[PDB]
Amino acid sequence: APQQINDIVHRTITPLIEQQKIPGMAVAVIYQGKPYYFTWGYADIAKKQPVTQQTLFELGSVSKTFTGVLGGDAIARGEIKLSDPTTKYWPELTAKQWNGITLLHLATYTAGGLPLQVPDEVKSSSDLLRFYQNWQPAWAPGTQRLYANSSIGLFGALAVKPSGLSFEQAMQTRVFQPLKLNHTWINVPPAEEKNYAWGYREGKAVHVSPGALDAEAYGVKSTIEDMARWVQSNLKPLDINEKTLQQGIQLAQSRYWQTGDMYQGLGWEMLDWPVNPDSIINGSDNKIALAARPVKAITPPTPAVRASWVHKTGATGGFGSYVAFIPEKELGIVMLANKNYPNPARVDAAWQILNALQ
Ligand SMILES: *C(=O)N1C[C@H](NOS(=O)(=O)O)CC[C@H]1C(=O)NC1CCNCC1
Ligand SMILES: [Cl-]
Ligand SMILES: [Zn+2]
Ligand SMILES: [Zn+2]
């Protein structure tokens, strides 16, 4: 790799690892459209298995960017419209509070206060229906953004219904396979388990536990090589030959809502570039990112702006992830770690690197 990339990566990530006590880490820096790979530490401490470019990490909420693009692909196929009512795809949701709640609201966390998690007691389809049927909104739809797995999670499950495919089958055939993300999994096959890093929480080795709508909201696992290719695909959608996927990527970076200097896409979040680094750093803290915040609708949604900072954070019990890219600069970064450490430290490090390479 160019010396300037090697230098800034060492001076930024090695101290981050020292500071946060991260056992293993993989980073890809995309510079002029080309990925450069870096690894540190161990995927499995006790086995002394090093992190490699083949190591699988839990992406956590970065999974939502796949969900958003799959939803955009469905829009481009004409299978769904974001203005469609939720009840069009789940007629059994007869409770009156669902009148006026659209796929757009589900996808962008603006349905009116759907909770951060689907309750852990939801283990059956019957349970899931009762959960949504009895949920009572705190606000009218389209007025407040409250980040919620139960919101975009339901969007993903309903967006694939017109295809007749399961969410996992839809994602594999329509997103993963066309983009040659051949080591990206909702469910890690047995033959690939050997590459699956352990997460570490308070010293204990852990993997994410199954839950309702997990695939849609936080359940994808991937390698640093596949995630670099994912970033390349979102930097350069015109290189994607499948027109519905090309357009789906573009639609996920459209700007549907604004709050402060932040714009809500489908999974992705965006800010204008050049960005105020303190905004993205401070705004990534859970105290802010998870707070209910008023939103202003953008009608029609702004088509993907090339001069944007596009990004997403993710976490599981034992992992911490971050992806950020700037289409106009063909510049991006993927940071995968097998410890959950605070978002602001990830974002700060990412901005130090990309700012140095602009
Ligand atoms: C996604 O990784 N999430 C959503 C939320 N934080 O959003 S983020 O952008 O700052 O990452 C909470 C943390 C995380 C999440 O929901 N993790 C689940 C916790 C419960 N067990 C399964 C994973
Ligand atoms: Cl140094
Ligand atoms: Zn040093
Ligand atoms: Zn393989």
Residue numbers in the entry: 4 to 361
The authors write:
We report kinetic and structural studies, including four high-resolution crystal structures, concerning inhibition of the AmpC serine-β-lactamase from E. coli (AmpCEC) by clinically relevant DBO-based inhibitors: avibactam, relebactam, nacubactam, and zidebactam. Contrary to the proposed mechanisms of the established β-lactam SBL inhibitors, which involve essentially irreversible formation and subsequent hydrolysis of acyl-enzyme complexes, the cyclic urea carbonyl of avibactam reacts reversibly with the nucleophilic serine residue to form a carbamoyl-enzyme complex.
In one (conformation A), the N-sulfate nitrogen is close to the Y150 phenol sidechain, while in the other (conformation B) the nitrogen atom points toward the opposite face of the active site. While the αBD angles are comparable in both conformations A and B (112° to 115°), the orientation of the N-sulfate nitrogen is stereoelectronically unfavorable for reaction with the carbamoyl carbonyl group in conformation B, where the distance to the carbamoyl carbon is significantly increased compared to that of conformation A (3.9 Å compared to 3.0 Å for REL and 3.8 Å compared to 2.8 Å for ZID). Based on the proposed decarbamoylation mechanisms of DBOs for class C SBLs and stereoelectronic considerations of the mechanism of the nucleophilic attack, the REL- and ZID-derived complexes appear less primed for recyclization, since they form both conformations A and B, than those of AVI and NAC, where only conformation A is observed. The piperidyl nitrogen does not appear to engage in any direct or water-mediated hydrogen bonding interactions with AmpCEC active-site residues. The Ω-loop and H-10 helix are located at the R2 binding pocket of the active site, and the different acyl-amido sidechains of REL, NAC, and ZID, which are positioned in this pocket, are likely to have an impact on inhibition of those AVI-resistant mutants.
